[PDB]
Amino acid sequence: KDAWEIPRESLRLEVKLGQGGEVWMGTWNGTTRVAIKTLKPTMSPEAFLQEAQVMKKLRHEKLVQLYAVVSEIYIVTEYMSKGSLLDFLKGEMGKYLRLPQLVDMAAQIASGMAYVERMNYVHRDLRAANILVGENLVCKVADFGPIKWTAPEAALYGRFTIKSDVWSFGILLTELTTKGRVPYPGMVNREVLDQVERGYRMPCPPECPESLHDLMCQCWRKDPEERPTFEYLQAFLEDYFTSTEPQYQPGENL
Numbered sequence: 131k132d133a134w135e136i137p138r139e140s141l142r143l144e145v146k147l148g149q150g151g152e153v154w155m156g157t158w159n160g161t162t163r164v165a166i167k168t169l170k171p172t173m174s175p176e177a178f179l180q181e182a183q184v185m186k187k188l189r190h191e192k193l194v195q196l197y198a199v200v201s202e203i204y205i206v207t208e209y210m211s212k213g214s215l216l217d218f219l220k221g222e223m224g225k226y227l228r229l230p231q232l233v234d235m236a237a238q239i240a241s242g243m244a245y246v247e248r249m250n251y252v253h254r255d256l257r258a259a260n261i262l263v264g265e266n267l268v269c270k271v272a273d274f275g276p277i278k279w280t281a282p283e284a285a286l287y288g289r290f291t292i293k294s295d296v297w298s299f300g301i302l303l304t305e306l307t308t309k310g311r312v313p314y315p316g317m318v319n320r321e322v323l324d325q326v327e328r329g330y331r332m333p334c335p336p337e338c339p340e341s342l343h344d345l346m347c348q349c350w351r352k353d354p355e356e357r358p359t360f361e362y363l364q365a366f367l368e369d370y371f372t373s374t375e376p377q378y379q380p381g382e383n384l
């Protein structure tokens with residue numbers, strides 16, 4: 131149909147990375163390592179391809195790049211050698227990560243979202259599970275397919291904006307700071323909602339600088355137009371150890 135189309139004989143689904151459709155570790159044109167997401171006919175093809183249409187209008191360093199499609203369905207993109215942020219934080223790598231390596235990822239994620247912000251788009255499902263990791267702590271926003279991650283106005287009235295994503299980023303920090311634990315521990319969905327409305331907000335994680343929890347609390351402000359742009363968030367996490375915590379010192383796990 132368009133310049134992105136590719137012949138299925140270019141691909142080679144070498145390893146099955148996950149389930150679903152599903153995700154494989156193919157190889158485009160037998161020389162390029164890539165990731166292949168397939169579809170098991172359950173949604174419409176034109177519905178499944180909506181994910182590809184969007185990836186053609188967004189090209190940034192902290193965003194997983196689209197390479198080519200197969201409308202007869204395959205979606206080819208760059209390959210992130212270390213799976214999602216979740217698996218990574220929960221793997222045996224998560225014990226070696228400290229605040230600096232975690233703020234560095236938080237900031238990169240904020241940057242791809244700063245691009246999104248400028249592009250006037252909204253991700254809607256910004257969370258650790260949809261943030262891929264590659265070599266040298268590289269991170270990129272992604273997608274494949276969550277009230278504990280969704281902003282009040284969004285889940286309650288469908289009011290999804292980039293400010294609702296700012297809410298989700300805030301919840302991402304608790305994931306990076308807890309290294310993979312589910313937000314709002316011990317609480318069930320319709321208990322999270324009834325609670326957050328009442329003013330509740332997650333407490334500062336163990337060994338997490340109160341200045342970093344301060345930022346979370348800004349990403350969780352009740353009034354949407356009060357949360358920060360990703361532009362502020364990115365810069366904030368870029369200057370963290372100089373402007374905010376210049377006396378920081380390594381801890382047991384943070």
Ligand SMILES: Nc1ncnc2c1c(Cc1cccc(NC(=O)Nc3cccc(C(F)(F)F)c3)c1)nn2C1CCCC1
Binds near residue numbers: 165167184209
């Ligand atoms: N490159 C990869 N390499 C190894 N694993 C990968 C991927 C990927 C990237 C990938 C694979 C298949 C589809 C996508 N789709 C999208 O990123 N879609 C998307 C749709 C709209 C917007 C955006 C974005 F630009 F905002 F990121 C992204 C992304 N996902 N995964 C999964 C995560 C753990 C199980 C495997």
